[PDB]
Amino acid sequence: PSQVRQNYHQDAEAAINRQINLELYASYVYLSMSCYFDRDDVALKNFAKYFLHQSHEEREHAEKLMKLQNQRGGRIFLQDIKKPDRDDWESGLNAMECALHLEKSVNQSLLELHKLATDKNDPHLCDFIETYYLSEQVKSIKELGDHVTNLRKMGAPEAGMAEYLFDKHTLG
Amino acid sequence: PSQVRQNYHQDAEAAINRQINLELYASYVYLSMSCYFDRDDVALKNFAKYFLHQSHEEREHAEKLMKLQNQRGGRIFLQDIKKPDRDDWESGLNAMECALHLEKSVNQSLLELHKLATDKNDPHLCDFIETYYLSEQVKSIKELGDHVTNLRKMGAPEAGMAEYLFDKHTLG
Amino acid sequence: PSQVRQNYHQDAEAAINRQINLELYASYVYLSMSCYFDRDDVALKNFAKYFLHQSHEEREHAEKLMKLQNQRGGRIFLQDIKKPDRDDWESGLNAMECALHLEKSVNQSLLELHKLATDKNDPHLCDFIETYYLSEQVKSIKELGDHVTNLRKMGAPEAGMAEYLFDKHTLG
Amino acid sequence: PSQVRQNYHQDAEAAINRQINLELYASYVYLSMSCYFDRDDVALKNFAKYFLHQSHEEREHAEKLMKLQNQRGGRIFLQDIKKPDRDDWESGLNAMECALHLEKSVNQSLLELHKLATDKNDPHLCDFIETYYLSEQVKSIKELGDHVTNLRKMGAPEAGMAEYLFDKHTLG
Ligand SMILES: [Fe+3]
Ligand SMILES: [Zn+2]
Ligand SMILES: [Zn+2]
Ligand SMILES: [Zn+2]
Ligand SMILES: [Zn+2]
């Protein structure tokens, strides 16, 4: 064992490595969305900016878990980052719905990690998760739900002005 | 020959004179568009401003080619600047589509000039074109394509609010 | 075809997608190196900082190619980002040697892309590569070669003070 | 019972008093280390400064637990502060190893206190521990492990320049 390791179960170490991969995957999905909105036949610059910001945030989430793994004396093992499920995200509304689904799946993973940390009596890891991840995920999910609600009410994607005006007012 | 002339083929000199005329023509087309949008029965001030800016930029493009011709020891020969194809540009969307077509035709001319410079082994002229023209044309074409996409999606020109709101948000 | 596309061969579009994947892979390799140097049993903070910076730079390289693909009217197709070849990078000297090898492999890919752009008479793409990529790769390769030279001369990794003092002076 | 006391078990009160004594003991150990490095035959001023800072921090830890005890309506009962195990700490490396061992023993005590608070359903005390203590201990342990790693790699204590240069660069 590492000279720093204390109260850090092998199952937690493995679960953190899984979470690192999931956050890197989420970053890649957001990047894919961002570059869809930069296409000349889509051309919604503030949707593109919004998803690029989310991509960079997910990267920061992954890097903070890497720092945690080393702080606790675990060892980082990286895996392939799978490509996103689609190249064409269809519409601003569809991308926001897909983002909401993704954020909820990441939250579910974090709740399973917290349950594991609780079961292994690892309060530092429980607190880490609560302080830096759970907080943030609830806020993200609520923001995406609000965006989906507004776009649907405005008539997106069939009402042509809806995504245009949402891009200007809400995301601009 | 001019005392400064070196590695500057007569065919390149002639092609630069042609390009000067094309950039002056493009400036004149944009000016025509600008003054259509200032009509009391059209009244889209930010479309007018956008096309007047493009007119002034094309002028600057022409003047920079004139400077190049003299720097290399060629001689500028000016020709008539033909009037634009229309006086009435119909709509904001139609003017943006016509601008996209014009910008692509200017780009095609510049690509033919680069091919000539390459064939005559004139690296200074190739670099000039690449650095000051090709760069700029790709950016212009992408911007106009984005504008056309947005106006179509918003319902222009039949949806009456589309050009009005595009003028305010995108061009304002 | 995209409304913006002009003089952009399908082979170039495919090669740009390959290059995007390679730059994302390079970013991931650097990230792996960074987190090796943050291990409690390695503990070289300025090596970690150096490789994290390189990771972020490779990301920016990838994102700029994505912007180019959309500017030219190509379509981005993402692929899996493969995991790096090692988790344990052994030493500061070994990581710098591996980085040098990686940077040379990325340079080779870029030279093949330039040759393709030249063969398809695509001067905008040739200029893009030259201006934003080739420049940068030569500088990177020279810097890594200088680092490898200095670490070897100092006696790394067997001379225990060498990586410590290099971390302080050169990377600090 | 105190007029403020609510949900504060007698076992928790006793455990907090034990922890106060342990933090005061740790402060005293660090003070002993600090004054070893100020000896004329040791003369490592930045090691001395580092351990004096740690001594003052442990004092602050103890005082914050005293504040908690009174905030919850417990009563502070002080005990003798035992003298440290050694007067002569031998070397910079040995002192850092002894500090790492001490910090891990304090962490173990805090984890036992958290388990007690959890078992007595005292969420305010659990949160206190997590927020102000567990966080800090993990960071301390990782920093000391990094210092031990670097000193060993540099050749301390037998390589005479190692502690001297570590004192200058890392601790200065
Ligand atoms: Fe509005
Ligand atoms: Zn995340
Ligand atoms: Zn022009
Ligand atoms: Zn790169
Ligand atoms: Zn303490």
Side-chain angles (χ1 to χ4, degrees):
Chain A
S2 159
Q3 71 190 322
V4 301
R5 194 185 189 121
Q6 182 170 33
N7 196 42
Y8 193 58
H9 198 282
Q10 288 286 351
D11 295 349
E13 177 178 6
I16 290 284
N17 282 333
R18 291 195 306 272
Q19 192 71 32
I20 288 164
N21 190 264
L22 182 57
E23 299 286 349
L24 295 167
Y25 173 71
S27 179
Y28 199 28
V29 173
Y30 279 127
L31 180 59
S32 180
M33 293 181 178
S34 180
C35 83
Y36 174 77
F37 291 102
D38 183 54
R39 288 165 55 155
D40 74 270
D41 62 351
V42 179
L44 293 166
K45 288 179 177 296
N46 293 318
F47 278 84
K49 175 173 65 80
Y50 178 82
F51 289 125
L52 189 62
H53 178 73
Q54 305 317 141
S55 178
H56 292 168
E57 292 289 313
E58 291 303 314
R59 186 178 60 181
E60 158 269 334
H61 300 167
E63 289 177 7
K64 183 175 281 77
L65 287 163
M66 292 169 178
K67 176 173 186 288
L68 179 285
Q69 184 78 283
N70 280 327
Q71 275 195 329
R72 294 296 302 273
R75 294 290 167 255
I76 298 156
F77 286 99
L78 298 174
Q79 298 300 158
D80 296 349
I81 307 166
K82 296 303 282 193
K83 69 178 184 181
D85 68 352
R86 295 158 224 234
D87 324 291
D88 182 329
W89 294 97
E90 296 177 334
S91 70
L93 173 59
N94 184 67
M96 288 290 179
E97 291 175 333
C98 290
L100 175 58
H101 180 95
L102 174 66
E103 289 292 346
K104 292 186 89 186
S105 77
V106 174
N107 197 36
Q108 187 56 61
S109 179
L110 289 162
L111 292 170
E112 291 168 10
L113 183 54
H114 192 282
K115 178 175 298 101
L116 180 57
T118 299
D119 292 353
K120 298 308 185 180
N121 307 115
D122 188 340
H124 175 263
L125 179 56
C126 288
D127 176 62
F128 170 85
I129 293 161
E130 293 158 20
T131 301
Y132 298 110
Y133 291 78
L134 297 184
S135 40
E136 190 80 353
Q137 281 311 104
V138 163
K139 180 176 338 296
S140 293
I141 292 164
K142 177 62 165 56
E143 177 170 286
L144 288 164
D146 295 346
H147 293 342
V148 167
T149 291
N150 278 281
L151 282 163
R152 281 181 194 142
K153 288 192 176 195
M154 290 170 81
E158 304 91 345
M161 294 227 213
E163 291 182 2
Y164 179 86
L165 290 176
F166 184 87
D167 175 279
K168 293 304 180 189
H169 301 307
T170 297
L171 302 181
Chain B
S2 159
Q3 71 190 322
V4 301
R5 194 185 189 121
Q6 182 170 33
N7 196 42
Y8 193 58
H9 198 282
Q10 288 286 351
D11 295 349
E13 177 178 6
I16 290 284
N17 282 333
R18 291 195 306 272
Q19 192 71 32
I20 288 164
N21 190 264
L22 182 57
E23 299 286 349
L24 295 167
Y25 173 71
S27 179
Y28 199 28
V29 173
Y30 279 127
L31 180 59
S32 180
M33 293 181 178
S34 180
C35 83
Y36 174 77
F37 291 102
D38 183 54
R39 288 165 55 155
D40 74 270
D41 62 351
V42 179
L44 293 166
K45 288 179 177 296
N46 293 318
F47 278 84
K49 175 173 65 80
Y50 178 82
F51 289 125
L52 189 62
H53 178 73
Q54 305 317 141
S55 178
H56 292 168
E57 292 289 313
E58 291 303 314
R59 186 178 60 181
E60 158 269 334
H61 300 167
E63 289 177 7
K64 183 175 281 77
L65 287 163
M66 292 169 178
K67 176 173 186 288
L68 179 285
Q69 184 78 283
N70 280 327
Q71 275 195 329
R72 294 296 302 273
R75 294 290 167 255
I76 298 156
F77 286 99
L78 298 174
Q79 298 300 158
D80 296 349
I81 307 166
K82 296 303 282 193
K83 69 178 184 181
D85 68 352
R86 295 158 224 234
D87 324 291
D88 182 329
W89 294 97
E90 296 177 334
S91 70
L93 173 59
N94 184 67
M96 288 290 179
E97 291 175 333
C98 290
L100 175 58
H101 180 95
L102 174 66
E103 289 292 346
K104 292 186 89 186
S105 77
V106 174
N107 197 36
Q108 187 56 61
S109 179
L110 289 162
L111 292 170
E112 291 168 10
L113 183 54
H114 192 282
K115 178 175 298 101
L116 180 57
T118 299
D119 292 353
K120 298 308 185 180
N121 307 115
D122 188 340
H124 175 263
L125 179 56
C126 288
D127 176 62
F128 170 85
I129 293 161
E130 293 158 20
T131 301
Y132 298 110
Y133 291 78
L134 297 184
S135 40
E136 190 80 353
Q137 281 311 104
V138 163
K139 180 176 338 296
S140 293
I141 292 164
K142 177 62 165 56
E143 177 170 286
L144 288 164
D146 295 346
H147 293 342
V148 167
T149 291
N150 278 281
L151 282 163
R152 281 181 194 142
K153 288 192 176 195
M154 290 170 81
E158 304 91 345
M161 294 227 213
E163 291 182 2
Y164 179 86
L165 290 176
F166 184 87
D167 175 279
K168 293 304 180 189
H169 301 307
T170 297
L171 302 181
Chain C
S2 159
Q3 71 190 322
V4 301
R5 194 185 189 121
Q6 182 170 33
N7 196 42
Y8 193 58
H9 198 282
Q10 288 286 351
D11 295 349
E13 177 178 6
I16 290 284
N17 282 333
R18 291 195 306 272
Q19 192 71 32
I20 288 164
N21 190 264
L22 182 57
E23 299 286 349
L24 295 167
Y25 173 71
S27 179
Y28 199 28
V29 173
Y30 279 127
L31 180 59
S32 180
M33 293 181 178
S34 180
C35 83
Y36 174 77
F37 291 102
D38 183 54
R39 288 165 55 155
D40 74 270
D41 62 351
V42 179
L44 293 166
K45 288 179 177 296
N46 293 318
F47 278 84
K49 175 173 65 80
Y50 178 82
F51 289 125
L52 189 62
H53 178 73
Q54 305 317 141
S55 178
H56 292 168
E57 292 289 313
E58 291 303 314
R59 186 178 60 181
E60 158 269 334
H61 300 167
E63 289 177 7
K64 183 175 281 77
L65 287 163
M66 292 169 178
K67 176 173 186 288
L68 179 285
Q69 184 78 283
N70 280 327
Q71 275 195 329
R72 294 296 302 273
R75 294 290 167 255
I76 298 156
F77 286 99
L78 298 174
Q79 298 300 158
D80 296 349
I81 307 166
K82 296 303 282 193
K83 69 178 184 181
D85 68 352
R86 295 158 224 234
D87 324 291
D88 182 329
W89 294 97
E90 296 177 334
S91 70
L93 173 59
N94 184 67
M96 288 290 179
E97 291 175 333
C98 290
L100 175 58
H101 180 95
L102 174 66
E103 289 292 346
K104 292 186 89 186
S105 77
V106 174
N107 197 36
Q108 187 56 61
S109 179
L110 289 162
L111 292 170
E112 291 168 10
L113 183 54
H114 192 282
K115 178 175 298 101
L116 180 57
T118 299
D119 292 353
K120 298 308 185 180
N121 307 115
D122 188 340
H124 175 263
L125 179 56
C126 288
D127 176 62
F128 170 85
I129 293 161
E130 293 158 20
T131 301
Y132 298 110
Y133 291 78
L134 297 184
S135 40
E136 190 80 353
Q137 281 311 104
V138 163
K139 180 176 338 296
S140 293
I141 292 164
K142 177 62 165 56
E143 177 170 286
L144 288 164
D146 295 346
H147 293 342
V148 167
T149 291
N150 278 281
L151 282 163
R152 281 181 194 142
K153 288 192 176 195
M154 290 170 81
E158 304 91 345
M161 294 227 213
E163 291 182 2
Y164 179 86
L165 290 176
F166 184 87
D167 175 279
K168 293 304 180 189
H169 301 307
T170 297
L171 302 181
Chain D
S2 159
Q3 71 190 322
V4 301
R5 194 185 189 121
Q6 182 170 33
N7 196 42
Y8 193 58
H9 198 282
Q10 288 286 351
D11 295 349
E13 177 178 6
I16 290 284
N17 282 333
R18 291 195 306 272
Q19 192 71 32
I20 288 164
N21 190 264
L22 182 57
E23 299 286 349
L24 295 167
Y25 173 71
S27 179
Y28 199 28
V29 173
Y30 279 127
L31 180 59
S32 180
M33 293 181 178
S34 180
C35 83
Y36 174 77
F37 291 102
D38 183 54
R39 288 165 55 155
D40 74 270
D41 62 351
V42 179
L44 293 166
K45 288 179 177 296
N46 293 318
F47 278 84
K49 175 173 65 80
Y50 178 82
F51 289 125
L52 189 62
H53 178 73
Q54 305 317 141
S55 178
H56 292 168
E57 292 289 313
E58 291 303 314
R59 186 178 60 181
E60 158 269 334
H61 300 167
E63 289 177 7
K64 183 175 281 77
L65 287 163
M66 292 169 178
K67 176 173 186 288
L68 179 285
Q69 184 78 283
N70 280 327
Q71 275 195 329
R72 294 296 302 273
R75 294 290 167 255
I76 298 156
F77 286 99
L78 298 174
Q79 298 300 158
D80 296 349
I81 307 166
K82 296 303 282 193
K83 69 178 184 181
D85 68 352
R86 295 158 224 234
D87 324 291
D88 182 329
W89 294 97
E90 296 177 334
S91 70
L93 173 59
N94 184 67
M96 288 290 179
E97 291 175 333
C98 290
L100 175 58
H101 180 95
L102 174 66
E103 289 292 346
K104 292 186 89 186
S105 77
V106 174
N107 197 36
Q108 187 56 61
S109 179
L110 289 162
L111 292 170
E112 291 168 10
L113 183 54
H114 192 282
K115 178 175 298 101
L116 180 57
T118 299
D119 292 353
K120 298 308 185 180
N121 307 115
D122 188 340
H124 175 263
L125 179 56
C126 288
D127 176 62
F128 170 85
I129 293 161
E130 293 158 20
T131 301
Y132 298 110
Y133 291 78
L134 297 184
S135 40
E136 190 80 353
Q137 281 311 104
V138 163
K139 180 176 338 296
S140 293
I141 292 164
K142 177 62 165 56
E143 177 170 286
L144 288 164
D146 295 346
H147 293 342
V148 167
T149 291
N150 278 281
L151 282 163
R152 281 181 194 142
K153 288 192 176 195
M154 290 170 81
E158 304 91 345
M161 294 227 213
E163 291 182 2
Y164 179 86
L165 290 176
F166 184 87
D167 175 279
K168 293 304 180 189
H169 301 307
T170 297
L171 302 181

